[PDB]
Amino acid sequence: CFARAIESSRDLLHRIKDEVGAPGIVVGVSVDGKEVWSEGLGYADVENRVPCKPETVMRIASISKSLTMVALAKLWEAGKLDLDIPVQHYVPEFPEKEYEGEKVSVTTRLLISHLSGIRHYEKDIKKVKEEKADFEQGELYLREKFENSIESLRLFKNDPLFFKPGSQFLYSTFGYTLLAAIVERASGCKYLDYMQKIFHDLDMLTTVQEENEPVIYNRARFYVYNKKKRLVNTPYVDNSYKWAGGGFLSTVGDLLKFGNAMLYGYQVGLFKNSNENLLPGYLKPETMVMMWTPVPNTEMSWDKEGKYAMAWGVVERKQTYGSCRKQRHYASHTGGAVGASSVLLVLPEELDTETINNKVPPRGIIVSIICNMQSVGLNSTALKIALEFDKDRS
Amino acid sequence: CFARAIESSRDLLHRIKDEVGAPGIVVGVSVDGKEVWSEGLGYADVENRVPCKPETVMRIASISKSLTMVALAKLWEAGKLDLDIPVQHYVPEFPEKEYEGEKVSVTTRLLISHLSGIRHYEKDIKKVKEEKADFEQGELYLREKFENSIESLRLFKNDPLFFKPGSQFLYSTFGYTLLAAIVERASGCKYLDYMQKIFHDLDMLTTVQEENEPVIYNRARFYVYNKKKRLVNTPYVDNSYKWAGGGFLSTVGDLLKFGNAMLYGYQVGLFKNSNENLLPGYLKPETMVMMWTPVPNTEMSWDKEGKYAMAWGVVERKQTYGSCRKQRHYASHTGGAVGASSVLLVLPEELDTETINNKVPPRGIIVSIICNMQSVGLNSTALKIALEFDKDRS
Amino acid sequence: CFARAIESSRDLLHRIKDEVGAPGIVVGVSVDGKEVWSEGLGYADVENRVPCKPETVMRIASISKSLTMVALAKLWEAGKLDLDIPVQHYVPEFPEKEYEGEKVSVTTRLLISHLSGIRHYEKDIKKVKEEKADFEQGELYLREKFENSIESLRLFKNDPLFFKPGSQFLYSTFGYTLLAAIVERASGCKYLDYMQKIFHDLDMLTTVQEENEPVIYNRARFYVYNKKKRLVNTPYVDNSYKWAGGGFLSTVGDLLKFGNAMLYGYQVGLFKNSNENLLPGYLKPETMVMMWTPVPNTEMSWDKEGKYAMAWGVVERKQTYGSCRKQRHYASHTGGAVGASSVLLVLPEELDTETINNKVPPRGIIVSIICNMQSVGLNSTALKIALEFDKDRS
Amino acid sequence: CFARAIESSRDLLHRIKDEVGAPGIVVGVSVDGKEVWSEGLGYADVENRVPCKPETVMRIASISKSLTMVALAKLWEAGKLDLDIPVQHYVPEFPEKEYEGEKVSVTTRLLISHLSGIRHYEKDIKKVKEEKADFEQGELYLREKFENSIESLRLFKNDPLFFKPGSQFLYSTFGYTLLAAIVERASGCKYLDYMQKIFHDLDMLTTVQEENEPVIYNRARFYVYNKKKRLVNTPYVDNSYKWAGGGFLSTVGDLLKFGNAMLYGYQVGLFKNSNENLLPGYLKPETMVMMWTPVPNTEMSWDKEGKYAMAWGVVERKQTYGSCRKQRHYASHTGGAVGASSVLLVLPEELDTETINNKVPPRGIIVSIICNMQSVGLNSTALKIALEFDKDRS
């Protein structure tokens, strides 16, 4: 039934692969909760000639923020965590900050949406202020091993705030390290154990953390181009200092399952009225709405047409003029890692009365693409693939 | 429902294609805001045997003037631009002109309708005056790259005026280069960025500018016949000096969407009285009327029966004698480029009381035809296709 | 019989294609005068999605020098041309040159082996002398059309000599333009007509010159990577000023046929004694030996282990120490063009008494590889493929 | 002819592989200068399921010392190097050393046989003295990159001598770093370039240095067992500080070729009398004898029955009592690297009058075994395989 869409999507994948020169790429498409397509192109390892397969394990980078958000939402549902309380309640090791000698408060809500003052890789305030008005970074190529989140906090716990909390949007990865410390303090257990339990609940059996010593099957390699336009290996790095921000490894099936679970949790409330036999979602319907609610004064780098919510980028639906562009509602998050690129997209389906009365959730399309090439933007390709699979479905 | 009309239209397309010997041709028909037919005949590329498809990208040439007019109308609605103010207010680099030593004023209104003195490709005043009482041109085969509109102005900013402003009609392309310079000066941003934003608003995702370095998918080739009556390739040209006049690339779907938007903006005022739930048009109803209002002392080359308005050729409706020709109201613009020919036609539907009370805008037919053959007139074929689709609709 | 070798060769081709990120590549292998393998990988045109095929026409660049050498050898056999006579005998438009006020002579023999003083793209003597002790060039991106070789001579006929003739090796392309002028003067006919006749004699029906106006079927596109590591189109260029140097277009089958003809002409003399029914080669046996004879004080850029002969790079066979590297005898020439890379390799087979008495010429392997990627070295891959096909043959 | 021996050797390889639990192992056997057997067992990479093949590239560790010795012998033959001159003549950056205030001289001859005072990984003199009367080391897991040998010298150039030069045998790896510095100073070129030229001369095309950025095909992985008796990956290390001591990567064919070249150079002098058509060896016959001459007061760790020579361990032939053990003459060197084990063995054949008069060199057997397992001794297995292949040969 999806044969026409599959061929075109494969053509689109070839287009992007040849445009960026990626040695390998893997895709995964799920329609209405069922996986209908999964393919790989190229070689996961070019030295040993290992072809790309749906079982390939690659580095999802910032899609990890979404997993941490799921953990935080579950903790908040359990009542252990309060969003508006200052972070010093849970983590007293973080020093209090001043902004030309005025009291400022850093909270979980500000940390989630990046509205907090914490910096990114750059340490020079002047350049950041000039830009507001890179893989060249050193901290991005660290190799030290950090046993715990509290030890990892020492990289940025002494730097001054760059902006007033809640005033300027600045994408950051250390804020989610602080969030992981808060999670492990509030839950009473280690962060990795909590995430492992969550992955077990969601049936994500191939999602593990970036480590070198353990043997991980079907692990791929990551490449980059040098100054002579020749494919080379990326340098060895250790990502233990940022587990929550970008330290996880996964496949396309696990991302499809995660997206399906989120879609079901989002859509179960609408279908609850017609049928009372539906199982409850992993998170409460009000929690799901809050997660996907856009926050004002936020930006979405991979799509200027939408904004940012909680660990997700959300584009809403609207139409301003007749016979003119009709915006479509979807949520997405992209990831950029040394040697790798990924994207996860969710496209909800507009629900009518008859569909609600007859059909059952989830109703939508989830698309996941991962490639072992550095600095590749895959949001547009995923959006096109999702739209075309939306056309075929009847 | 349109099956009878589609077959006849295809026959008409074959007629014109065999008459001119065009290697390929693409058509697009929209009825009442919905695309009902789209087909291609022949080969977009004859060297590699690439068939013509609705996704083919060809060179719309002077249909670009309409896009610039949309930009100018939006700027005028915003209040940034004044039509009657002399152009030296925005562009002081253009020298003031004299006509046997008398002061003359060049304004935006004169530039839009070609009533201005600026010349076309020919530089000899005597021949132009004799004709008033060609692909053989050199400027039509330029290959230099021009970074900005101000740099492009140097090709004609020193030539004397050919006629008194507002006195003689002379179709010109450099006047729209001056218009683009005025647009980029008044809007505060670059012309290409403004047009890109406008195209994004109107959902024209495949409309780009003529460039060689970037990879543009489904780009076609352009051909001409030599002295031995053999098909050959057209010479390489650069169109950077005239973006506004004739430097864009598009498909038939984008032209259909543009025509539908213009038709909705034209017709929403009549339907506003019955229903208040209709979304506003892209431009105000008074702006649309002005755009399609014919201007006296103007000519319409592709149809002697009508006149010229603002970047459009408009034929009105009238009937002088009983049992004799009944003129029909429509608007059209044709384009001639090296190696290419195109046409865009809009046929509004006569509105009665019951149709206004019951139906919703837009009500009409838009037809777009593009072929990769030089010096082909497609206005009559488009008019016949539009009329026949007007017959089938019930 | 060659199934094992074919698979490995395909793997080698994939290796180089992924290493350089070439959108397409075509290979051709001939064993003992019969074509046994021919395949293409990737897309010849990425905008229109045209797959690579053995019929693809790409830009062989400096393999053209070999064709001009064949023309010169045939003229010398006919007795029309003398190698040691100064070039002013045939072309008096070339000015005589002095070297700190001493008489120097430029001859055909010096021009063939690049021992002449004529420069390459660089015009600064100091930098060339420093290097002796680039696609960044301007002359490499010319677009002017030159009707005849004498007109083309004006680009370098006034520059002073860089080194003493016969003293320093300097690879050059304008020397072969002078050679083409000499050919067309001595033969009494135009250079292109002579080469067309030669191609007709050798059954190379798809070998034509680089031109834009004529329709050439199966013509490919040429690409390069920009500063953002994104695939883009190469700029439009005109190669009319260097027909003999790098101005021809060809397939892999034509190169295979050319190599087979050269191999037969080389090897027919050894087999003449046993059988008198063998047809004569295209060139006399003594002429073939001279063509492949290495010249002292010459360099072979694509293989430091060999030297240069007449329009060919020749590596001889030798062994200095026991149980140590055994050199193999072969001839090759590589080509680098804007947007393209190519190689032609000939691997003669060692002949014994029984093989000479029983088998018939040609006995060897010819390999041709062309890719639409700029600055790719394909000599090593061709050598490996030839050696592996040498192993399978029995 | 060797079918009986091959099966038994394979059984022996299985025996050692199961005894040590090595995931993979590769063997290579050459008889009389011709490779007669080559096989691999297990997986080179267990995560991606890549089987072991003869083309696998693994870490030869201290077999590198033999390559440096070949370089030093060639330099000494050229007359550039003097063995008895103090090392301060070539490398003045090395400080002079005192031994309870007495002048001591460090020379190339002492450095070659490890009779020099320089330490190994351990820095505590007391423990070394107690042992004389480990992978637990820190310097063995360094990750810093060192551009040149002079920079690498700083790791041990300030430590005091452990024993009097020429008095006590102490195996060391930094002495060969000093030897590499001496080589690059005396030869006038970089060490890596000299070794690359030597490898090219000996037809060792797959022998490269340990580097991460370049793409090296068929590169294997290296494993170790943890405290829970589970297979894990070895930690990432950089071996740039010891190129000469333990930094090379190779296959079994390259080691076979190297051993064959050494055997030919050793045996050509005996066969020179009968036949004058034999090509000269890579090194002079007197040089080869010196290389394999055992040095008094030296030890051979992998075989207590023999001693040490120049970068080789040599066991001589002798028989003390009648009807009792008859010693056999052979040379060998083993290597231990993080995650890897290797051995190279040469078994010369006893030469009689008729064999010298009739046969041609080389006459012997070379055996190479490499496995991706840490701390495995393979000398006995290689000796047994060589002896059994010695039995089959007739």
Side-chain angles (χ1 to χ4, degrees), chain D residues 88-109:
Chain D
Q88 273 87 38
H89 184 105
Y90 309 95
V91 189
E93 294 95 344
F94 201 70
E96 69 275 16
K97 300 298 173 65
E98 308 290 325
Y99 207 83
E100 68 274 15
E102 86 173 332
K103 302 292 184 180
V104 298
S105 190
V106 182
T107 61
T108 303
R109 216 187 258 282

Side-chain angles (χ1 to χ4, degrees), chain D residues 244-275 277-296 298-302 304-306:
Chain D
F248 288 98
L249 273 170
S250 193
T251 63
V252 286
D254 294 352
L255 297 188
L256 287 188
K257 283 161 182 143
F258 173 52
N260 268 316
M262 301 294 108
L263 190 59
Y264 188 99
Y266 189 71
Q267 287 190 338
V268 72
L270 277 296
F271 290 76
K272 181 67 172 178
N273 58 355
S274 69
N275 197 358
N277 296 115
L278 304 179
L279 302 156
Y282 195 68
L283 303 174
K284 293 179 197 316
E286 54 264 20
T287 310
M288 283 304 303
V289 172
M290 188 190 60
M291 179 181 297
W292 283 350
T293 295
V295 176
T298 48
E299 297 140 33
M300 200 181 141
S301 288
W302 48 103
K304 68 181 178 67
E305 165 152 356

Side-chain angles (χ1 to χ4, degrees), chain B residues 47-48 213 216 218-219 233, chain C residues 47 213 216 218-219 233:
Chain B
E47 281 181 338
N48 280 121
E213 183 178 1
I216 294 156
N218 304 305
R219 164 152 56 176
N233 282 292
Chain C
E47 281 181 338
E213 183 178 1
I216 294 156
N218 304 305
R219 164 152 56 176
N233 282 292

Side-chain angles (χ1 to χ4, degrees), chain A residues 136-146 148-204:
Chain A
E136 306 174 5
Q137 306 288 148
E139 284 157 291
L140 198 55
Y141 294 97
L142 281 193
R143 295 181 300 204
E144 194 197 331
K145 182 88 173 156
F146 290 84
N148 57 314
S149 301
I150 308 298
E151 182 65 26
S152 307
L153 278 175
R154 83 172 164 82
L155 285 168
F156 65 99
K157 74 176 177 183
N158 290 0
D159 291 331
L161 289 185
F162 276 34
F163 302 90
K164 267 194 73 176
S167 163
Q168 171 94 21
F169 182 82
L170 181 68
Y171 198 90
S172 187
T173 314
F174 296 131
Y176 275 63
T177 298
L178 189 43
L179 280 171
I182 286 179
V183 160
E184 61 86 20
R185 276 289 169 82
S187 71
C189 49
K190 294 181 176 67
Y191 171 79
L192 282 187
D193 291 331
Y194 206 70
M195 311 291 324
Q196 192 36 258
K197 181 266 290 180
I198 289 172
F199 299 152
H200 185 241
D201 287 347
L202 258 63
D203 203 347
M204 320 174 57

Side-chain angles (χ1 to χ4, degrees), chain A residues 228-275 277-296 298-302 304-325 327-351 354-363:
Chain A
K228 278 88 70 179
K229 315 263 174 61
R230 295 289 184 266
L231 195 80
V232 293
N233 282 292
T234 43
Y236 166 81
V237 293
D238 198 356
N239 285 337
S240 60
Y241 67 101
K242 39 159 195 191
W243 287 131
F248 282 104
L249 273 170
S250 193
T251 63
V252 286
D254 294 352
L255 297 188
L256 287 188
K257 283 161 182 143
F258 173 52
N260 268 316
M262 301 294 108
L263 190 59
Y264 188 99
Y266 189 71
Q267 287 190 338
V268 72
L270 277 296
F271 290 76
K272 181 67 172 177
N273 58 355
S274 69
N275 197 358
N277 296 115
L278 304 179
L279 302 156
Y282 195 68
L283 303 174
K284 293 179 197 316
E286 54 264 20
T287 310
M288 283 304 303
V289 172
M290 188 190 60
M291 179 181 297
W292 283 350
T293 295
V295 176
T298 48
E299 297 140 33
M300 200 181 141
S301 288
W302 48 103
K304 68 181 178 67
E305 165 152 356
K307 274 184 172 296
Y308 202 80
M310 291 190 166
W312 278 94
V314 181
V315 178
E316 292 289 335
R317 63 159 302 180
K318 62 160 204 199
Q319 183 174 2
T320 316
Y321 312 89
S323 295
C324 286
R325 172 161 180 87
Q327 209 162 294
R328 187 84 184 262
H329 175 65
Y330 77 93
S332 169
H333 209 337
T334 61
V338 184
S341 292
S342 54
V343 60
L344 176 65
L345 190 136
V346 178
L347 188 82
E349 175 192 9
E350 288 104 353
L351 298 162
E354 57 270 348
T355 303
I356 279 172
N357 284 127
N358 308 321
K359 300 293 183 281
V360 298
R363 308 287 307 177

